């Protein structure tokens, strides 16, 4: 036969979903462990039979269980079972989203939120800069890159943006399709100030004097809307 | 449960919670914050009291046993002015808190434990700091080193190798051979040393070659030549050996103003010796580099506070050090621009607000080595006599104002220098660096000095008399200032690169040897309490001083508190 | 005109510059090897005619006053 580690971790998971399916047979109640394993068996033996696709197996995880055929809370439980399944064209992941829906009142993990907003960035006044994606090509900007040396395809008014990163909730992003336009909001970047990489533009303490060098690099290296006057003075160290 | 009169009780324990302090016969008021002690279970030592076996003293002590406890100590830091018991086992701050007995009482925890190891510190009524910390040492004569440590400084960090005319004017210990000569010398002391090293040539190697010997940093200094040249070479080798540059700048506007200067620094970390400028620097207006993020400005002790007699004794004392005549148009025009009353005045009032984060003392090189703490709280005093007390207040009190100035010359200096992971605060987990003060004495004349965990360093009556007290009581060496204890309770600081070589065995060492780190990754934003950054303009004609568009000035005193009651010359 | 020269003063002495000053001082050639570090990283090699092109080009891209170099500057290998 010359099994694999993974042809016997799938035979356990099939014999733990046939166990799932004959204890739904005899009415009992599922809970999360029968749920997930019944689906990802049924999934399997699907794709073994290569009449379906990937995706009309996606669509048909869901239709296995019934709210009624499972313990009060495991609906709430299974966000999503991912199964990897061997189809006549090779492996392919099958993920099925919220396969059961819920119908008790039990959530295991429930959150009780109060309901006042967040207040991100307090103390910390944004300004407003309007910016066009002039290249053929989507950019996306994270809530603390440097936006003043963001790609040099984007054109907006550098000078006003320098020290500066989105006002925008950590981890979020603001993305512009190409030949899109639009308005964003800056804040101050924080701490110590000291920029160091993102395009090499500063590498250093971030302040009025190194602004007129990040100015003059951004010129030299072709990042829209930089207007460095000319007859630039250069200083000892560049 | 009884009921105590706040008056017997304060005579007993020291103030509690809410009981304010009157710091020296300065108009400074503390306020105790906060209070680790269980209403009646303190702890006291004497015959009859409770620190006896059995009761205070455990029978059954924890394994962290305390070597010494400091009991109902009024801690004055940074982090807050508050009462507690300090623990202190084998030369670190064990713990802050309680302290006691667990078998006989309810809140001590294993790092607070008395048992039969531990000795007693009475502490009521008194007040505990950090040990200062000086950062702009010449070292001239040893002879300096009892005089700061008798005033409350217990690291001195400089550079200098005797009396020197290189070392008169600079604080630089040039080479590896002078370095090592220092080394070995500094074995003599109580006092944690560390050495700044020659920042004024543009070769690297031999600049890496110093830190390498054992500097801690490097001093660019004018008289050896602040060129803008070495200033960038200096600091490219210390970003890459992780230790800190100090710079007194071209007053001569030789090769370049001060904006030339700022420009060679690049945006890189740099502290800057007395700031204000009467000791050196671009004239007239260095001290606008006090507003900056990359720079951590000191100041030094002779220009603060401003007095009646500064303006003409400065003046006297340019005339001395550089030789000059008054007979010589050019020398006063020298003079002129160097000393500036303007600046003086509002270097005390920039003080004030912040923007000066370290004091400092240019010892025998225009300062007196044991008068920084003593000039830092006169400064105090004189901004609350001036301009009242400060709108960060938190109540009818001074605290805030007492942290900020306490930290210009405790852990300010520290982070400056990359120690304060070890010194610069009463902190669990820090050397055991301490200084004892009555407040009636608070900032002028301590108690006790406890270096290493041990003392050190007390005020002392005769040999011979039957109790301590009895006079003539002046300060005297104790036991961990002599023998192989000076070795235990004393630290010599050495850049990381060094101690990884061995530089203690190399040079046969046998005080601790450790590390400076963190020195390039700190910005006037890392000051605890002064982190006021401003744009500072210089008018070049009136030499007025503003800060955010407003002229910042102050007036002259005419007489300081801390000065003629405590002291008989 | 001042390329690889000092004040022809006393050793130690100094000339005074008040804003808006104007006098004429007195220049000699810089003795021993001539080898010129520091001062402004203007130098920092050898002193003769071929680096003082390229100090004054330093020179003049750093604002100094006075410093007039020749426009079309070409470059060398090592500047
Ligand atoms: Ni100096
Ligand atoms: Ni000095």
């Known amino acids: 036969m010359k099994l694999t580690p993974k042809e016997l971790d799938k035979l356990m998971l099939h014999y733990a979903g046939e166990l799932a399916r004959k204890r ?88 009780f939120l109060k309901n006042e907003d967040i207040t991100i960035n307090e103390g910390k006044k944004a300004v407003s800069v309007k910016v066009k994606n002039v290249g053929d090509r989507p950019v996306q900007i994270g809530s603390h890159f440097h936006f003043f040396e963001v790609n040099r395809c984007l054109d907006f008014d550098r000078e006003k943006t320098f020290g500066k990163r989105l006002d925008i909730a950590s981890g979020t992003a603001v993305r512009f399709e190409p030949g899109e336009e639009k308005s964003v909001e800056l804040i101050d970047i924080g701490g110590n100030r000291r920029i160091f990489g993102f395009n090499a533009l500063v590498d250093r303490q971030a302040d009025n004097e190194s602004k007129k060098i990040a100015l003059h690099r951004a010129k030299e290296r072709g990042f829209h809307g930089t207007k460095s006057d000319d007859n630039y003075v250069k200083t000892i160290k560049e | 449960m009884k009921k105590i009169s706040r008056k017997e009780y304060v005579s007993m324990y020291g103030p509690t919670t809410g009981d304010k302090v009157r710091l020296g016969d300065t108009d400074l008021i503390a306020e105790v914050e906060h209070d680790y002690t269980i209403y009646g279970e303190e702890l006291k030592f004497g015959g009859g009291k409770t620190l006896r076996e059995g009761m205070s003293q455990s029978n059954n002590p924890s394994k962290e046993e305390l070597d010494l406890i400091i009991t109902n100590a009024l801690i004055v830091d940074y982090t807050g002015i508050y009462k507690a018991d300090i623990g202190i086992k084998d030369g670190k701050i064990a713990g802050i808190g309680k302290g006691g007995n667990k078998d006989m009482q309810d809140g001590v925890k294993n790092n607070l434990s ?16 950090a040990g200062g910390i000086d950062t702009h040492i010449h070292f001239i004569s040893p002879q300096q080193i009892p005089t700061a440590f008798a005033s409350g400084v217990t690291t001195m960090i400089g550079g200098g190798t005797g009396p020197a ?37 543009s070769n690297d190697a031999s600049l890496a070659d110093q830190i390498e010997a054992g500097a801690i940093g ?43 200067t700022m420009a060679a620094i690049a945006g890189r970390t740099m502290h800057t010796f007395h700031t204000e400028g009467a000791g050196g620097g671009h004239a007239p207006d260095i001290i606008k580099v006090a507003g900056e993020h990359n720079i951590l400005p000191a100041s030094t002790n002779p220009t603060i506070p401003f007095t009646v007699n500064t303006e003409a004794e400065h003046m006297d004392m340019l005339m001395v050090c550089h030789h000059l005549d008054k007979s010589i148009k050019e020398d006063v025009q020298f003079a002129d621009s160097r000393i500036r009353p303007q600046t003086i005045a509002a270097e005390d009032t920039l003080h004030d607000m912040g923007i000066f984060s370290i004091t400092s003392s240019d010892s025998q090189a225009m300062g007196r080595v044991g008068e920084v703490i003593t000039r830092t709280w006169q400064t105090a005093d004189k901004n609350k006599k001036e301009f009242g007390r400060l709108k960060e207040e ?64 007390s005020q002392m009556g005769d040999a011979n ?8 009581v002046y300060y005297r060496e104790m036991f961990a200032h002599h023998g192989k204890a000076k070795y235990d309770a004393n630290i010599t600081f050495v850049s990381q690169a060094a101690y990884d070589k061995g530089i203690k065995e190399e040079l046969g060492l046998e005080r601790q040897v450790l590390p400076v780190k963190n020195c390039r990754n700190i910005t006037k934003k890392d000051m605890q309490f002064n982190d006021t950054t401003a744009h500072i303009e210089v008018n070049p004609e009136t030499y007025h001083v503003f800060v955010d568009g407003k002229e910042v000035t102050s007036k002259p005193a005419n007489k300081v508190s801390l000065a003629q009651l405590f002291s008989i010359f």
């Open chain 2, 114 to 129: 008395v048992g039969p190891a531990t000795e007693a510190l009475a502490g009521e009524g008194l007040i505990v700091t």
């Open chain 2, 465 to 472: 008399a039957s109790i301590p007290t009895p006079q003539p």
């Open chain 2, 218 to 260: 490097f001093k660019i200094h004018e008289d050896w030549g602040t060129t803008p040249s070495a200033i960038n070479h200096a600091l490219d080798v210390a970003d890459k050996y992780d230790v800190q540059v100090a710079i007194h700048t071209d007053t001569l506007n030789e090769a370049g103003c001060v904006e030339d």
């Open chain 2, 165 to 201: 005319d290189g070392t008169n004017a600079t604080t630089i210990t040039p080479g590896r051979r002078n370095l090592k000569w220092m080394l070995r010398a500094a074995e003599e002391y109580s006092m944690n040393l560390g050495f700044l090293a020659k920042g004024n040539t």
């Open chain 2, 394 to 457: 938190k109540g009818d009190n001074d605290n805030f104002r007492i942290k900020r100035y306490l930290s210009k010359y405790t852990i300010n200096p520290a982070i400056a220098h990359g120690i304060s992971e070890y010194v610069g605060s009463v902190e669990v987990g820090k050397v055991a660096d301490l200084v004892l003060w009555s407040p009636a004495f608070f900032g002028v004349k301590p108690n006790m000095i406890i270096k290493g965990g041990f003392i050190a360093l």
């Open chain 1, 24 to 111: 739904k047979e005899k009415g009992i109640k599922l809970n999360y462990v029968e749920a997930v394993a019944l689906i990802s068996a049924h999934i399997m033996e699907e794709a073994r039979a290569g009449k379906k696709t990937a995706a009309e197996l996606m669509q048909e995880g869901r239709t296995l269980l019934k709210p009624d055929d499972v313990m009060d809370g495991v609906a709430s439980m299974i966000h999503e079972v991912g199964i990897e399944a061997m189809f006549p064209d090779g492996t392919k992941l099958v993920t099925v989203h919220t396969p059961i829906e819920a119908n008790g009142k039990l959530v295991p993990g429930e959150l």
